[PDB]
């Protein structure tokens, strides 16, 4: 009645020895995590990395929460210092409940939230961090530069060390040149009481990694990749406002839902409670969503592992149907480790070469495609070189990198080989096929790939 919470997801604790590589232990425990979406993992009860800032040094600018059920915000984008920030976050939980601000239970603060964003006649606004780090303010983890006591370099390369994930070499995010800040550098979250994250899943249908530092609870409710359609059906009947086409990456619309709506459609859901010092992980397209208990501090970051590969590329074939921006080409990426294969790690070698092979025969299907329609003429181009914003598809606003057609009637405008058409309306004879790499030189690269992997 009212409110029926969703059975808890998997709960992990491993031993110092399965701890010690991260990319080993999520691989381990994917066959079960995965049917959850989410799952939490118990550090070892020595590994405990420190924390310590200025409280009154630090400053960010919040932004402000109306909490409503269904109605639409924008994903991403005053003064507070941490402590003043603080400050307000106590006082306005103790006023609430005129209760010491622990004695409040989590179930009960779990069951008021979905009581207020339901309810019309209130309107509670709350606030919150959102940021990557900054030098006003940075990594919770340990950095290099400033002396660090020893305790700290015990931690400053530890695989859960948050800064290292991405740049580690399991990971496939790695190696990418080319700038995106936005998902390979940690962002950091500063919450108070019912301060929430709407439903969503990650760029590029990623993992991600989540830890609290310190502070009260966060609570979370998650759904399994395979159900991801079943949940945007549910949530395009009862909300399609955002479901409309949006200009680009900075307007993306999502919502605040409760679980048991779903769970009513036949859609799975589970929770948890995440405590201070433990970590949160979500598995490729699980939505998540949830909000914080009270004052706290978490930090959490994207990350892709070989697993991920194949999923990446239906992502991308996924957006061009949705007619979505990308962050970065995938190709782009694929050619990149291809072109670096003689130092990659063998495993690592072994599924880009997959994926290639993939990519080849697509791309060559693709050419013979066009010629039929009398593109005739051709010229090698470095995409690579040109900002993102220079190489969408025109129509599906896919980034380019394998090719793409261009006309002289249209100087700078470009489609992908599935909208051929969509360019203008002159005769196909006076396009051009622009490329990259003739299939020529696309397969010693996969060799050179094939040869590292043995
Ligand atoms: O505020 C947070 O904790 C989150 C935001 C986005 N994804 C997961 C968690
Ligand atoms: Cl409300
Ligand atoms: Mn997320
Ligand atoms: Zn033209
Ligand atoms: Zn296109």
Partial sequence: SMFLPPPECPVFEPSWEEFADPFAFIHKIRPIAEQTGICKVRPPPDWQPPFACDVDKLHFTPRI??????????????????RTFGEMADAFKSDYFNMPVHMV???????????????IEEDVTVEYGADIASKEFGSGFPVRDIK????????????????????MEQSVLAHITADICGMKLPWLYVGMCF?????????????????????????????????????????????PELFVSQPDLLHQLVT??????????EVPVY?????????????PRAYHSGFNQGFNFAEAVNFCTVDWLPLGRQCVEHYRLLHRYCVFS????????????????????????????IMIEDEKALRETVRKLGVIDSERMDFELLPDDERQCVKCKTT??????????????????????????????????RYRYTLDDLYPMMNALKLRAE
Wanted: contains cysteine; glycine residues 4%; aromatic residues 10%.
């Fill in 271 to 283: 929770r948890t409670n995440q405590c201070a010092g433990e970590f949160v992980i979500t598995f």
């Fill in 148 to 167: 660090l006591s020893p305790e700290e370099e015990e931690y400053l390369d530890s695989g859960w060390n948050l800064n290292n994930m991405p740049v």
């Fill in 105 to 119: 239970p989590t179930e009960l603060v779990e069951k008021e939230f979905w009581r207020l964003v339901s309810t």
């Fill in 256 to 265: 605040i839902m409760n679980p048991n709506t779903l769970m009513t459609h």
């Fill in 330 to 357: 995938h190709d782009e990426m694929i050619c990149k480790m291809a072109s670096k294969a003689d130092v990659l790690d063998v495993v690592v070698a072994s599924t880009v070469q997959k994926d290639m092979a």
């Fill in 65 to 82: 929460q109306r909490l409503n059920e269904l109605e639409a915000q924008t994903r991403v984008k005053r003064d507070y210092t941490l």
């Fill in 195 to 239: 301060s929430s994250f709407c439903w969503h899943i990650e760029d590029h249908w990623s993992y991600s990694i989540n830890y609290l530092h310190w502070g009260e609870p966060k609570t979370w409710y998650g759904v399994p990749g395979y159900a991801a359609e079943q949940l945007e059906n549910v949530m395009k009947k009862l909300a």
């Fill in 400 to 433: 380019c990198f394998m090719s793409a057609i261009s006309c002289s009637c249209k100087p700078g405008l470009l489609v992908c080989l599935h909208h051929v058409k969509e360019l203008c309306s002159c005769p196909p004879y006076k396009y051009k096929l």
